[PDB]
Amino acid sequence: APVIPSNTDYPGPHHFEVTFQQSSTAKSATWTYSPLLKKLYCQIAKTCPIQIKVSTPPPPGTAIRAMPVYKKAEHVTDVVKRCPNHELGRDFNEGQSAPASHLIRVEGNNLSQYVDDPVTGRQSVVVPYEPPQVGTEFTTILYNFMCNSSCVGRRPILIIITLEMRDGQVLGRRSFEGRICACPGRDRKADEDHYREAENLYFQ
Amino acid sequence: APVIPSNTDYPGPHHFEVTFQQSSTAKSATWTYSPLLKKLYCQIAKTCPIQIKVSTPPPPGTAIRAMPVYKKAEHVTDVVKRCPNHELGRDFNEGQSAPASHLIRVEGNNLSQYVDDPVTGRQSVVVPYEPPQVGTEFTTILYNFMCNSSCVGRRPILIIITLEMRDGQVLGRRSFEGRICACPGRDRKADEDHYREAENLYFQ
Ligand SMILES: [Zn+2]
Ligand SMILES: [Zn+2]
Ligand SMILES: [Zn+2]
Ligand SMILES: [Zn+2]
């Protein structure tokens, strides 16, 4: 059963790219991306957007999957899910139709597919690919992450984004580390400060 | 060679206790202790004090050793030392007589012994035990930690404090996790905030 989903960057025939729009630099920001650390910081259940770009359009019926995987060797074969206390509680579950066990939801998409793989047990969310507005650059996807990094037990998570044909064939792949808490702006500032401490230590 | 120094709490015949005086709650504090997380937060090369208490005085010639040990299983047999970039640089080394490879120094003590164990390679710092002022409660030891947590590569460190006879026999032992950065007050607040996120999740 315990497969590790493939992760390597794969630009593919359509030069699939995943980027992040410009983010607030405030301690109060609802999400923020650190280019320095290559880390996306978001808040539980709040909009956490990515930007997709392709160089030419993909074929008809293409989709985009998001699949979280734990990064550390001792966790990599464990399926990433909502923590049980969030899963069985009321918060963000009532009035919502997405399965409570899933970590990743998509906001603003009514053709979302929450997948629980029967063979691997991996959980992911798939949406159909939508091209950008005529003459514009990016397709935006609004994710919502439904647990904090503090919920388990931090265990770093990689979010693997794939461009996929209707038959499942991978046409592109990128990934990013996602960090979730009630103070993402503060976490960015602290991680960047700690990083800088050490980056001035090198000799020459 | 690769011994793991013994760590278990051992009050011993003199009920050896290690505590922390009241700390500033400011983001600007030079050191601070979290009773919630059981963590001491200090700054590189700055005073980082502990309080020793015994119920009756120990015997003549007794000493107190501080020995850092990495907490995580994959690091526990690695000797904890100053990172090489700090060790071979000028900062806090020039004008000072403590060996540059040592992580832990003692401030204000002129009988400090910097030990490099010939068999184990473990590095520690020993001072003679001094009783409190007549009719007072605590013996204070001023440590200075000479690398940031960011220096390696955080790798959590346990600081093991032992009360020892002249012959090396252990009369008492306690320990604490130490966290070192240029913003200890901020780290405390962030860790306590993240901790609280998760502590309200339990059911009943
Ligand atoms: Zn959770
Ligand atoms: Zn936070
Ligand atoms: Zn260092
Ligand atoms: Zn800090």
Author numbering:
A (entry chain A), B (entry chain A): 112 to 264, 268 to 318
Sentences from the paper on this structure:
The p53 family of transcription factors comprises p53 and the paralogs p63 and p73.1 Under conditions of cellular stress, all three proteins are activated to induce genes necessary for cell cycle arrest or apoptosis. All three proteins share a similar domain organization containing an N-terminal transactivation domain, a DNA-binding domain (DBD) and a C-terminal oligomerization domain (OD).9 p63 and p73 contain an additional sterile α-motif domain and an inhibitory domain at the C-terminus. Both p63 and p73 share approximately 60% sequence identity with p53 in the DBD, and DNA contact residues are strictly conserved across all three proteins. To address the potential for similar p73 assembly, we solved the high‐resolution crystal structure of the DBD of p73 as well as its complex with the ankyrin repeat and SH3 domains of ASPP2.
The final p73 structure was solved using molecular replacement and refined at a resolution of 1.8 Å. Unusually, a disulfide bond is observed in the p73 structure between C153 (S2′) and C159 (S3), although the main‐chain atoms remain similarly placed to p53 C135 and C141, suggesting that the oxidation has limited structural significance and is most likely the result of insufficiently reducing conditions during purification. As a result, p73 residues R201–A209 adopt a markedly different conformation to p53 C182–A189. Instead, the p73 insertion induces a loose helical turn that places N204 in the equivalent position to hydrogen bond with both p73 R193 and R216. The p73 DBD is the last globular domain in the p53 family to be structurally determined.
